[PDB]
Amino acid sequence: SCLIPENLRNPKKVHENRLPTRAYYYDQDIFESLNGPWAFALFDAPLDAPDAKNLDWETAKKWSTISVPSHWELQEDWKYGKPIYTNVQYPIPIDIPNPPTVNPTGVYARTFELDSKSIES
Amino acid sequence: DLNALSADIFSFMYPTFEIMERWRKNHTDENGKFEKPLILCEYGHAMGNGPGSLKEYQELFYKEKFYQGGFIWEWANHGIEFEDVSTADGKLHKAYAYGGDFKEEVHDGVFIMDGLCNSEHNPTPGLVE
Amino acid sequence: GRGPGESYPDKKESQRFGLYDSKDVEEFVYDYPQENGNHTDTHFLNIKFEGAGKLSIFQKEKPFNFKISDEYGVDEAAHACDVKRYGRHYLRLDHAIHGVGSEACGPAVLDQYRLKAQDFNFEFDLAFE
Amino acid sequence: SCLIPENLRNPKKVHENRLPTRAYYYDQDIFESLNGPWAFALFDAPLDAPDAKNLDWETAKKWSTISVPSHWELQEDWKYGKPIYTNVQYPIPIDIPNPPTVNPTGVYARTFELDSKSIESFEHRLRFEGVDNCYELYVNGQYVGFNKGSRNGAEFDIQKYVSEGENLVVVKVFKWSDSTYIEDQDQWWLSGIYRDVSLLKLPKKAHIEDVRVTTTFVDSQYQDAELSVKVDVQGSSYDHINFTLYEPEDGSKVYDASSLLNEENGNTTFSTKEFISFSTKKNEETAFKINVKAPEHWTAENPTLYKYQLDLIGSDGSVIQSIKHHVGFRQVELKDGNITVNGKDILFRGVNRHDHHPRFGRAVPLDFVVRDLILMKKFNINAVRNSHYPNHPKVYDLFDKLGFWVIDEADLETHGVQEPFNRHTNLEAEYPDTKNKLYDVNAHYLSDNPEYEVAYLDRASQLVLRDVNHPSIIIWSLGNEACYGRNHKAMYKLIKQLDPTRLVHYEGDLNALSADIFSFMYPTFEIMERWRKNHTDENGKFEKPLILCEYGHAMGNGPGSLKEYQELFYKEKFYQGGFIWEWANHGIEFEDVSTADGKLHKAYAYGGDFKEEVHDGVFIMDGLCNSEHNPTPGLVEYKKVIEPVHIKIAHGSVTITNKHDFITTDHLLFIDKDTGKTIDVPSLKPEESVTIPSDTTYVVAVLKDDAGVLKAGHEIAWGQAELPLKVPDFVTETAEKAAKINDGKRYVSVESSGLHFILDKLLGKIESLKVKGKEISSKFEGSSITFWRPPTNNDEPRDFKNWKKYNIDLMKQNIHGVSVEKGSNGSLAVVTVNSRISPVVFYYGFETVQKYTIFANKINLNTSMKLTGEYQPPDFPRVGYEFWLGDSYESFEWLGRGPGESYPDKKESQRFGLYDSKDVEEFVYDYPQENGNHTDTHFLNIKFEGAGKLSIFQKEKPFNFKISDEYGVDEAAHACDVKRYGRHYLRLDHAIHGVGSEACGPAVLDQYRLKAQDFNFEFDLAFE
Amino acid sequence: GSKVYDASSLLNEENGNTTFSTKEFISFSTKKNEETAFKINVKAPEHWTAENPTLYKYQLDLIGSDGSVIQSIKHHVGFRQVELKDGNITVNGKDILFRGVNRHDHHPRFGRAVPLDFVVRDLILMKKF
Ligand SMILES: [Mn+3]
Ligand SMILES: [Mn+3]
DSSP: OTTSOGGGSOTTOOOSSOOOOOOOOOOTTTOOOOOEEEEEEEESSGGGSOOTTSOOHHHHTTSOEEEESOOTTSSGGGTTOOOOOOSSSOSSOOBTTBOOSSOOEEEEEOOOOOOHHHHHO | OTTOTTOSSEEEESOOHHHHHHHHHHHBOTTSOBSSOEEEEEESOOOSSOOOOHHHHHHHHHHOTTEEEEEESOSBOOOEEEEEEOTTTSSEEEEEEOTTTTOOSSOOGGGGOOOSBOTTSOBOHHHHO | OBOSSOOBTTBOTTSOBSOOOGGGOOOOOOSSOOSOOOEEEESOEEEEETTTEEEEEEESSSOEEEEEEEEEOTTTOSSGGGOEEEEEEEEEEESOOOOOOOGGGSOOOOGGGSOOSOOOOOOEEEEEO | OTTSOGGGSOTTOOEESBOOOOOOOOOTTTEEEOOEEEEEEEESSGGGSOOTTSOOHHHHTTSOEEEESOOTTSSGGGTTOOOEEESSSOSSOOBTTBOOSSOOEEEEEEEEEEOHHHHHHEEEEEEESOEESEEEEEETTEEEEEEEOTTSOEEEEOTTTOOSEEEEEEEEEESOOGGGGGBOOSEEEOOEEOSOEEEEEEESSEEEEEEEEEEEESSTTOOSEEEEEEEEEEESOOOEEEEEEEOOBOTTOBOOHHHHHOOOOSSOOOOOOEEEEEEOOTTSOSEEEEEESSOOBBOSSSBOBEEEEEEEEOTTSOEEEEEEEEEOBOOEEEETTEEEETTEEOOEEEEEOOOOBTTTBTOOOHHHHHHHHHHHHHTTOOEEEOTTSOOOTTHHHHHHHHTOEEEEEOSOBOGGGGHHHHHHTTOOOOOTTTTHHHHHTTGGGTTTOGGGHHHHHHHHHHHHHHHTTOTTEEEEEOOBSOOOOHHHHHHHHHHHHHOTTSEEEOTTOTTOTTOSSEEEESOOHHHHHHHHHHHBOTTSOBSSOEEEEEESOOOSSOOOOHHHHHHHHHHOTTEEEEEESOSBOOOEEEEEEOTTTSSEEEEEEOTTTTOOSSOOGGGGOOOSBOTTSOBOHHHHHHHHHTOSEEEEEETTEEEEEEOOSSOOSTTEEEEETTTOOEEOOOOOOTTOEEEEEOOOSEEEEEESSOBBTBOTTOEEEEEEOOOOOOOOOOOOOOSOOOOEEEEOSSEEEEEETTEEEEEETTTTEEEEEEETTEEEEEOOBSBSEEOOOOOOTTTTTTHHHHHHHTTGGGEEEEEEEEEEEEOOSSOSEEEEEEEEEEETTOSOEEEEEEEEEEOSSEEEEEEEEEEESSSOOSBOSEEEEEEEEOTTEEEEEEEEEOSSOOBTTBOTTSOEEEEEGGGOOOOOOSSOOSOOOEEEESEEEEEETTTEEEEEEESSSOEEEEEEEEEOTTTOSSGGGOEEEEEEEEEEEEEEOOOOOGGGSOOOOGGGSOBSOOEEEEEEEEEO | OOOOOOHHHHHOOOOSSSOOOOOOOOOOOOOTTSOSOOOOOOSSOOBBOSSSBOOEEEEEEEEOTTSOEEEEEEEEEOBOOEEEETTEEEETTEEOOEEEEOOOOOBTTTBTOOOHHHHHHHHHHHHHO
């Protein structure tokens, strides 16, 4: 299935490059929040989303913003859809391990500042 | 994992007293020893007016060392706030959505509203009981 | 009788006995409209009329059930705001009421709480001050 | 008075050992929160409270806890009393400067841990953001100091008193003091530590104490500017200071609550887009002046900010302390008689905002304040007045970042000195041009009292010095309604010495002898105009301008005539706008017993609900937003009248005028609503306009992109061509149908295929009208034409008194003759009713003729009402029919104004269109009153289940209507007290009285009053 | 565990210069080039239990050659042992009883993006019931 990206239909692709899980401790001096407004665009499926290896901030600047954290089905005026409730039944067809081809894809973008000393320290 | 082949505990959801009692008896040996206990990971479904007979479950919990209690389902209704058109009024009002209100192709309706607390996470008579 | 909140055969024990005034109670609004507001094990009920005192109501030899409300269209109202209201209140004065159980997901109302089909015999007094 | 402690009755004891006020900067590394649960006990008076010099933690441990911050009148189960509402009147006896002897005293206690290294490394302070009314402070059983000024901050040096290990903080808080006399704001009386408490750890050997930042343009063309940064460094062990200004972030920057409130952090790199850098030299002044090439201006319409970092640096070249804040390049002047920012004479589109939350009171979560301001921006507001005190210090960065013109106001109100005078002299009215002579009588008690000078100066000093560095603040105000005296003059001198960069406001000073601005509250247009003319010389020059610090009182249904105030604002350069009173209702959430139900319901309290001895009732509920801080129709209307772009559509032309002070229209997308295609609008500068030929009826001005706290597509302005009244194309059945007419002794029947008309001739009542499955009948009590409405808050002081006096609520219809004839021109029958409609007790009334022309599918109702008799009312609330709707009734739809309610002087925000009742959440007033009317209604369709619609239209003029459920509105204290019928009614009205702002301000204007006169109007009841 | 908390003190996240505690009980140091781990015997510590959540605060410091603090972890220890013992779920030797609920992440407006403030609200209510 070349119309569905490989990593969305691979049960073994649990992550790529994720660090090993460790015990959680919040530390104010270490943790710096990136919550707030991010540039955001929603696409019908992966193939309509831009290549992120070529996405400028100059391009993403022009998008609407969404606030992180939040679900995109819970926005002012249901801008990016509405919530779906199912109990037992899957809301997709069962074709393990394929997801549906039309697969809502949201691209988030924001920037942050880094010091000369920061990268060194 | 009914027989806890790879668990340390037995667990039922929404069991009948008779079913609890069958299990107890089939897992207590002649000496009165049991190898693993029973919890109710989900019981006393709290949907709407109810749950009834929390009393009878409790009496059972206190009577047998083999039972170690339960966790009622659920803490709070999953209602989402939205604008509803009133069937009484013909006008727009704040309400709490369950399946169908967002016009899903497939949904499970009012099973969203199964908490001891309402959608605003405030106590119902269920929690009080 | 039992209060301050509602009570049902298998959902009543949290509601201790005492003298209760409707003015002190915020009656519970269900997120999904359904049977509500019953008071079980009622010894007597006083209904206050402006400028004319009270009407006392009691059932002979057994406590009774009652509901005083405003509401209708409850069966088909999808949300609290869909509930219709009359221009006057009614009294629902009941000899008996079915239990509540947890059958939406779990056991049916237990036998001793079911309002089984049978003969009914009961006596009420409507005592006017 | 030895039964009252000396410090609670000494106007000069403003504080003991409080540090000098400095510019506020929050720093996460320095600030350590002491918020949370504290040991707390309440005592009847000071003499019952323990001696804090002997209070153990072992003893205080045993008390109940209260959470800081919070008011003690707002606890679970009203444990420590209930809120008290007074407007003008003091809730205490006036015996200046004594407070009452019985003076609620709350003792707070908690502990905190201190390290060995901590005491060595840092200077330790306690900072209290706000405590009401005043307090003495103890650490480890030792007196630290005393403080007055409830909405001001305070820092105390704690170094001498602290130990390694556990440290005990004890705060003794008093409800009343000599300070109470100057804290008489029209608001809730609430006590306690209601704002943050912090432990500050400053670097010990040297630290930054204070910073002053000013931006002065060098030139009359406002290009190059001088940035002046002066630093006060405390201690010897430092080398110099560094300063970095970063490249600007445009005011169009996108924010949300999370990013606005983010407080991080130590290792967080503030910015790296360097613009200017400066270093000081060893042993030289820790201050400097920099020339800045053509910087981006800070404006409320475009709050462009330059971030900066100020570093204190030691001998080893390491950073001792950093301040990360911002600079807004802005200059305020009094120039050619106008308040001027960067050379431009600005317009205030403002509100007064108190600190209020429906559950927490004046202890407002910052989250909630952000909510307020986002809403303000969403509704075209550009300015706020801090009525009547400074807010939490963190709020001012919010103004800086979002862009508001801010009047920061001293915590000083004296109003209550007038109340005994008002009652003794039976004073009926105060007017902005003359009322100062009344206040002059009592100024000697406080504002002209030398004993209070120190206190008055303290309120000024505290106000200015805490907030000096916020570009959003352009005006300092000396307080509110405190009369006028020497103390105000003293405050003015001090503020100008402290901060020459801003202007001074004080409304109590009519002639602005010690203010830079003129200010009125609730003035009449005539009064505004008298003032303008008396202060403009023969050349057209004025020395100072006029603002309305309070106007358009937003209490309940209203305010009316915002339109007429605005027209005035735009017409004269001398007027620079106003701030409406108020932002939001001050309602406190509580459990109410229902008058409708007999049951308990959530409601919002105003005066009386908490059973005060003395209170001022419903004057709590005077906001554009309700108690839950959500928009009312007031806010909706205000947004429209103040829209910063005018769109006028006439004669095949759209004229667009830019009404901003600074920004262009470039950020706006103009949509032709009739076609959906956008309109190419040239970039318009302030006051520039353009006419574009178009066939359009309806043009909208909308935001192109997310900017600030607003979303793409957000409506800023709009315009419509006026809509002619068109008769619907309903076909009346004029074919000849056989019809049975039964004219009985009392009742008259007209029956035909699909039609049933019964009238009670004795009453003039329609018993039943059923046409094609659709039924109505008259909602009858005395009369078939009624005049009453549940009085608005504005109606109460005068119009209601008149309407009650003339028994308008008891209008009766007395039938004189009924005429029944067979149908003529396609007609089935004509029933004509002659009657007198007059109230009991009275002569005046209407000689009335009601002609019912009955067709098979339509009923024409002609009403002729001739005003007759002596001793008439001036005006009526309303005039029209009331009809019960059949059981079939489900919904309605109308052509006219919407989606919300509308009234003669409160309607323009409600554009024309086709509206469906199903799409509208009808507004619930916190205080039940006249609501739900729709004015300028072209036609109304009432939908009946399974039987289609009934169409209703008035001939030759648009009409008024209300469809509802409700009654007992007059006497319902709260929303939950409103009663409801088992069926809906239609209130179908020829005309309705305007709304005005008379609860505090001008009566409904003449052109909006429903004057007593003859009424003649024709309605059609067309059945599908 | 009888310690008094509120939303503010439960959620307080501060801070760098804040002195965690100073009521020292036990101290341990590791030696250069040795395992960065250890086992300590603790004399009759206070038990952590759900009915009494007694906690020992601790501070763990990473230390450089110059003896300065590279990084700190400030957390707590709850002295508690869970076992399967004679067929029962056992904490500190005691066969416990679950008085429980299932709690999903839910907020009526934000969904699964629940403010911590709101979670605290949930748990206070649970304890109150
Ligand atoms: Mn509904
Ligand atoms: Mn009430």
